[PDB]
Every structure is written in C-alpha cells, then in structure tokens.
Amino acid sequence: DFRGREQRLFNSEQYNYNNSLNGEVSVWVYAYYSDGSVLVINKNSQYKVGISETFKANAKPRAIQIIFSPSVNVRTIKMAKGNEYLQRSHPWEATGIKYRKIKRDGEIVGYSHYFELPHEYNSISLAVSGVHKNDLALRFCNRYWAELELVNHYISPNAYPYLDINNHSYGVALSNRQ
Amino acid sequence: DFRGREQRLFNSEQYNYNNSLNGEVSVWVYAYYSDGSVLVINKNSQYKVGISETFKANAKPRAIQIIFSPSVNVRTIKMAKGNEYLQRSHPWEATGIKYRKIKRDGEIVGYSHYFELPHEYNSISLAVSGVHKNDLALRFCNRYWAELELVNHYISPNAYPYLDINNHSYGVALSNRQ
Amino acid sequence: DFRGREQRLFNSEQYNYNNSLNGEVSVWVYAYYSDGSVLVINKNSQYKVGISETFKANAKPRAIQIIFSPSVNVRTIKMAKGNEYLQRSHPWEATGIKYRKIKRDGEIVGYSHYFELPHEYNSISLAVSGVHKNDLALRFCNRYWAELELVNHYISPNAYPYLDINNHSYGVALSNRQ
Ligand SMILES: [Pd+2]
Ligand SMILES: [Pd+2]
Ligand SMILES: [Pd+2]
Ligand SMILES: [Pd+2]
Ligand SMILES: [Pd+2]
Ligand SMILES: [Pd+2]
Ligand SMILES: [Pd+2]
Ligand SMILES: [Pd+2]
Ligand SMILES: [Pd+2]
Ligand SMILES: [Pd+2]
Ligand SMILES: [Pd+2]
Ligand SMILES: [Pd+2]
Ligand SMILES: [Pd+2]
Ligand SMILES: [Pd+2]
Ligand SMILES: [Pd+2]
Ligand SMILES: [Pd+2]
Ligand SMILES: [Pd+2]
Ligand SMILES: [Pd+2]
Ligand SMILES: [Pd+2]
Ligand SMILES: [Pd+2]
Ligand SMILES: [Pd+2]
C-alpha cells in the first residue's frame, strides 16, 4: 500500500514543520471584545516570535488568548502587560507554566494561555514572546464580528490551532496519520 | 521607630528599581507643537530602550525633549534625526554629553536633552536609544492640549521625571527618604 | 589643478559612504499600484536593514521593486512574502542571485529586484532584509500619483538609485569623478 505510505509520509512531513532547521514559530493573540467580536494578531517568525500591541475600544476588550505553535519552548515564554506605579512593577512574568496543550487525536497542535480582564479595564497593552525548542517576521491582523466567524473564516481554512469559548479544540493531527 | 525604618526601606526599594537585575530602563520623547499641545511617547524595556518615530503636523512640532530614566548609561545614548544628502549624512550623534540630570532633593530622577527645531521644519523623524548601566517593550503615546495638562494628568500621577518650559523639575526623591 | 583634485576627492568621499565604518545601508521598497501610483518605503540603518510591510488596496498593488544601497552584501539578502498552508510554506527565500546592479557610468549605484504579482493578489505582505558588506533606523514612506512624480520629486532630488518601468537607470556616479 504505497498510496497509504505516501499519505502518512506527506502528513508527517507537515507535522515535521515543528522540527524545522529554520525554526519556524508562530504566535496568535486573540482579543475578545464586549460586543462579541474577536480581534486576532498573528506573527510568524524564525527562532523566536513576539507580539507587542495595545487593544483599545464603546466595545472594550474583555479577555485575551495567546496561542503558540507547537515549536515553542513553553519555558521561554514571557509576557508583560499594562494599561501599579511603573517604578514598582514587575517587568514581565514567565507565564509558561499556565499554557495548556491544545490536542487533536493525542497530538499537541499548540499551546494556549487564556485570561479574562477585570471590568475596570477599558484597555490592555501586551507584549508576549517565546523561543523555539531546539527582521523577516510577517504580521497579520483582523477582526471578526463573532467567534463563529473566526472559526469558519480563519481557524478552519488555515488548519490553525484554537480553543473556543466552550473549550472546544481545533487543529489537525498530522504526525504519522492519514 | 520601626514605622520610620519601614518607610525608608519601602522608598529605598523603590529607588532601587534603578539597580534592578532585570535592567528596567524607560525613555520618554516629548514633542512640543506650535499650538501649545504636547505629544508624549513612552517606551519601557529591559537592558536597552529606544524609540523611532516621526512627528508630522497646521500645528507643527517646534521642539523635542527626550527623557531617560536614571538607570540609563548616558554614554550609550545615540540619536539619529531626519526630515542634507543622505549619502553625506552623519548616521547618528552620541548625544549623551548634552543630557542634564533632573534632580529632586539632590537625587537624580532622570536625564533630559531638549532641543528646539528650526522654523524651516514642519516635521522630524527621530530615533533615540540608550542602554542601562550595569521584544517585550510596552509603548504608550498620548497628546495633551497643554503642558499644564501633561503635568496634571500624566507626569504628576505617575511620579515621572520631567522638566517644564520654565525649567521646573518634577519627580520624587526616594533613596533612603520618607 | 587643485580645484579639479578637490572636486574628485569630494565626490570620492561621497562614494566612500559605501565603505563607512558606521556600516550605513539603505533599502527602498516600491509598490506599483493598478492606478499607476507608486508607494515607497525607505529605511536607512547601520549594519543591516530590513522592512516588513503589507500593501493593501480599489487600486491594488501589481508589482514590487526592492532596491538596496551599494553597501549591501547581496549574498545576505532574504525575503519572506505572504497574503499555501503556512505549515508547508518556505519561511524565506535567499533572493540575492536575482538582484541586478543598477549602474551609472560603470559604477554600481544600487541593486534591484523586481517582480510582478499575479492578478489573483489584492495584497502582499513582505519582509526583506540585508546585511552590509564588511534600534536607530529611520523609516520614510510616501505615495506618488505616478512614477514620473516619484522620479521628479523623490528619486532625482535625492540622487537615489532607481530603475523605472522602461528599465531606465537613475543615480549619480561619484567614485573618483567630477
Ligand atoms: Pd534555535
Ligand atoms: Pd488589523
Ligand atoms: Pd492591526
Ligand atoms: Pd495587519
Ligand atoms: Pd461568515
Ligand atoms: Pd471564509
Ligand atoms: Pd468540546
Ligand atoms: Pd545589562
Ligand atoms: Pd498616540
Ligand atoms: Pd502613537
Ligand atoms: Pd500608542
Ligand atoms: Pd485637566
Ligand atoms: Pd488626571
Ligand atoms: Pd522652578
Ligand atoms: Pd559589519
Ligand atoms: Pd506612508
Ligand atoms: Pd507608511
Ligand atoms: Pd512614514
Ligand atoms: Pd510634480
Ligand atoms: Pd519636488
Ligand atoms: Pd534607458
């Protein structure tokens, strides 16, 4: 069954994108707004990736989900967030330990850290960064009027990892699968 | 008087933010416009910080003040500015020697370099950078309709270092003070 | 003829900007739009320079020209471009070998890589980077309603290297010339 072997090999080489020499690593930051809309920023880079952005509004950001590709080393993830005197602030937190595996068919398709913002916030500025396990970054942003639209028009056609409000997992298991 | 000791210790630990292991360093660039308004950009980072921005207008930028936190090593400050053939330009100036100490109660609360722009300028693009004495940067920007508003609504509630048009100094002395 | 010697010396020192200790290197990205307009982004930096930008529209970008100053080492040029599953994408291409010398009087005044976009594209996001042969970068952008305006109002008064739609070369030869 060479057809079957070829199918597995082809899918495996696609999971193998997580062991690239070129060290590809992606991060997505999702901002969940009070009108139900979702703003997404995606950066893809090599070796390390981070995003630094502010999310303003009278629909205000209510929650953040950060998702990293499975090539990230979770132990290197750092996050800083702001608008409490700066001069008594923590400069960052090492948030790795809070990231959960997003799994499909027992394969890790990404890592997620999700946190709600207190109602007192009309904004967050946020920087997050991670380095891959062992300049040319492209950034994408968009807004979707609902999480269902995000899922149908962005997550699903790109086969991206995701976790929705119901904690449903999205992504495609590839390692040695047909 | 343990209450007094505790007060001093608490304030000292706040000045000690200038000797952090984490190497926190801040820069503020103020742009003074012809209508009396003030635009501020603040970046806070670790180890080094720089800002690179252009200030356009029919109110035009008339002057620039750069302020660094007291953790900066003034000897590492570099600045580039533009709109004189590029191909005969200086790529940067090491401007450290022009920065004055902003002092409160004999304590350095920051370093300031201030320069007016010639009337021929309707714009400046500016990059400035400094490294601390021995990715995750958060940027903030705002505009205030007058320097008094800047002072009341930004400098004063944040206890930030500043120098106003009259050369009045702002900031809070903390090292071993109550 | 000391006047003649001085003229040559002065022009030569201007070509010598391509052998600076300070490692000045420039890149220009031109985006040619379907209405005949031209968008330009210029970054000048030291040692390495790159630009990462997206060009959106109902006039759409139709072609890209990347020009580097003659200080770039063409062997270090890398480019990434996007909107074909990310998870089966090449992260970059080393495009150096496609860059042609722009020449004036037998002197290299820059390097050009030009490519049209397929009609299927309403956008490109693009990152390009190069390192000089052996933080403080200033970026400029503008739009011109036609390539002739670009040439008269940007290329010509700045003595910049360029290649126009007819493959006509622009720039000024300086090495040991009057
Ligand atoms: Pd690596
Ligand atoms: Pd966007
Ligand atoms: Pd955006
Ligand atoms: Pd975007
Ligand atoms: Pd839809
Ligand atoms: Pd769709
Ligand atoms: Pd579920
Ligand atoms: Pd250090
Ligand atoms: Pd702003
Ligand atoms: Pd701003
Ligand atoms: Pd801002
Ligand atoms: Pd006020
Ligand atoms: Pd206020
Ligand atoms: Pd005073
Ligand atoms: Pd070098
Ligand atoms: Pd522009
Ligand atoms: Pd622009
Ligand atoms: Pd610009
Ligand atoms: Pd014209
Ligand atoms: Pd002109
Ligand atoms: Pd020609």
Side-chain angles (χ1 to χ4, degrees), chain C residues 32-82 84-101:
Chain C
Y32 300 92
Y33 273 71
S34 56
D35 70 340
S37 64
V38 186
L39 210 150
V40 60
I41 301 172
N42 173 225
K43 199 185 285 190
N44 312 292
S45 204
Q46 303 215 135
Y47 310 116
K48 84 180 157 59
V49 64
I51 278 171
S52 189
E53 297 283 348
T54 108
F55 304 96
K56 310 179 68 122
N58 289 206
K60 44 157 199 137
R62 292 284 321 111
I64 300 294
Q65 187 175 195
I66 300 160
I67 301 173
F68 277 100
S69 69
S71 49
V72 81
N73 179 341
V74 144
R75 320 302 273 252
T76 66
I77 300 167
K78 295 179 173 73
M79 185 176 68
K81 58 171 180 82
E84 343 102 290
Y85 281 95
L86 170 261
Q87 34 281 79
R88 68 165 77 111
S89 286
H90 291 267
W92 47 259
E93 199 56 52
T95 47
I97 191 172
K98 297 173 163 172
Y99 275 80
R100 40 247 219 284
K101 288 169 195 179

Side-chain angles (χ1 to χ4, degrees), chain A residues 10 13-14 17 22 24 26 28 44 46 135-140 156-161 174, chain C residues 48 50-52 54 78-82 85-92 125-129:
Chain A
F10 177 87
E13 279 167 27
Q14 299 188 285
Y17 196 75
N22 306 126
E24 282 95 320
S26 296
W28 288 268
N44 312 292
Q46 303 215 135
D135 294 352
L136 297 156
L138 297 168
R139 178 194 172 277
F140 161 87
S156 174
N158 286 299
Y160 288 161
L174 297 163
Chain C
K48 84 180 157 59
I51 278 171
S52 189
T54 108
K78 295 179 173 73
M79 185 176 68
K81 58 171 180 82
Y85 281 95
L86 170 261
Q87 34 281 79
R88 68 165 77 111
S89 286
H90 291 267
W92 47 259
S125 69
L126 191 21
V128 71
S129 136

Side-chain angles (χ1 to χ4, degrees), chain A residues 18-35:
Chain A
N18 304 301
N19 306 317
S20 167
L21 252 47
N22 306 126
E24 282 95 320
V25 54
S26 296
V27 62
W28 288 268
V29 179
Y30 299 86
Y32 300 92
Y33 273 71
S34 56
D35 70 340

Side-chain angles (χ1 to χ4, degrees), chain A residues 86, chain B residues 24-28 42-45 49 67-69 71:
Chain A
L86 170 261
Chain B
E24 282 95 320
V25 54
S26 296
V27 62
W28 288 268
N42 173 225
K43 199 185 285 190
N44 312 292
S45 204
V49 64
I67 301 173
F68 277 100
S69 69
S71 49

Side-chain angles (χ1 to χ4, degrees), chain A residues 86-119 121-141:
Chain A
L86 170 261
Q87 34 281 79
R88 68 165 77 111
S89 286
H90 291 267
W92 47 259
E93 199 56 52
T95 47
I97 191 172
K98 297 173 163 172
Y99 275 80
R100 40 247 219 284
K101 288 169 195 179
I102 304 169
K103 281 185 173 213
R104 292 298 279 95
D105 295 3
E107 177 181 297
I108 302 172
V109 295
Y111 296 98
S112 167
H113 179 202
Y114 178 69
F115 54 99
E116 290 157 28
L117 303 166
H119 229 292
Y121 291 54
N122 66 280
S123 278
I124 357 92
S125 69
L126 191 21
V128 71
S129 136
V131 178
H132 96 125
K133 304 152 167 101
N134 187 3
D135 294 352
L136 297 156
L138 297 168
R139 178 194 172 277
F140 161 87
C141 49

